[PDB]
Ligand binder design. Structure first.
Ligand code: Q7Q
Length: 259
């Protein structure tokens, strides 16, 4: 990097969101006036949870990712008690909150989100990078409503968390592959259109069985092109899922996506 960062370089503004390990704040770099987000994580929490060194890896990965639909990490630093991530600010907030406000997305908004996700994942696959738990809460909106993936690139542990967004291979304790991200598109496409993710339940263990079985239904208003895309992405067998190019070339995506 070009700079040594300290907290005194930044004027902190209001909280943008509150996470398990800490909060995200609006901030402004004092000398340049550059507005950004600062995500502040407590070291003690990271340690106790056993994710401290995992974060380090994901930050290094993230620091090398440049793409209009991937939230930019500009730098990072620390002090005795906290880690600080210096991020691109996404002024229209999370897709989660947009989904709550609208209850569900129309086909053009969904198709365009899926296209933008798929471009970002395709850029990440060209670097051998994958994701885990891509969820509306981790997807952000830029100044012109463009999707930004905030969820860092995933890095594994040595060889309780929510199951909604995980593919069969992750949960059955099996080998995994970039094709996890194809499963993620399927889950997200469904959730964008329907308003809830497709394997939801009141219990984790029930959600587990639903995913393993790929057991889900479509409400009557979900159209055939959409049912086609979602069903090809939610294949139990990773090899039967399409490639990212096939998602971008799918007639329902091309009929509804903004070009
Ligand atoms: C290990 O860390 C990986 C990076 O993860 C994140 C980077 C940036 C994020 C959120 C990230 O994770 C999710 C999280 O911590 N939440 C509290 C969810 C709230 C979303 N924030 C709302 C928000 C609004 N405008 C923003 N501009 C930039 N970043 C933002 C936000 N938040």
């Amino acid at each position: 990097k070009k700079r040594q960062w300290a907290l005194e370089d930044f004027e902190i503004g209001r909280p943008l969101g509150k996470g398990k390990f800490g909060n995200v704040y609006l901030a402004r770099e004092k000398q340049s006036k550059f507005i950004l987000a600062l995500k502040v994580l407590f070291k003690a929490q990271l340690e106790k949870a056993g994710v401290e060194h995992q974060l380090r890896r994901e930050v290094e990965i993230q620091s090398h990712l440049r793409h209009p639909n991937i939230l930019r990490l500009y730098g990072y630093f620390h002090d005795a008690t906290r880690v600080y991530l210096i991020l691109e600010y996404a002024p229209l907030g999370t897709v989660y909150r947009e989904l709550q406000k609208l209850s569900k997305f129309d086909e053009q908004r969904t198709a365009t989100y899926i296209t933008e996700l798929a471009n970002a994942l395709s850029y990440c696959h060209s670097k051998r990078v994958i994701h885990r738990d891509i969820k509306p809460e981790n997807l952000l909106l830029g100044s012109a409503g463009e999707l930004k993936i905030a969820d860092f690139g995933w890095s594994v542990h040595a060889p309780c968390g929510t199951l909604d967004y995980l593919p069969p291979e992750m949960i059955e304790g099996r080998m995994h592959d970039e094709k996890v991200d194809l499963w993620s598109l399927g889950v997200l496409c469904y959730e964008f259109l329907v308003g809830k993710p497709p394997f939801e339940a009141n219990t984790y263990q029930e959600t587990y069985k639903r995913i393993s079985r790929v057991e889900f239904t479509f409400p009557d208003f979900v159209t055939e092109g959409a049912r086609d895309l979602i069903s090809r992405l939610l294949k139990h067998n990773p090899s039967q899922r399409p490639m990212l190019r096939e998602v971008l070339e799918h007639p329902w995506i091309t009929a509804n996506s903004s070009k």
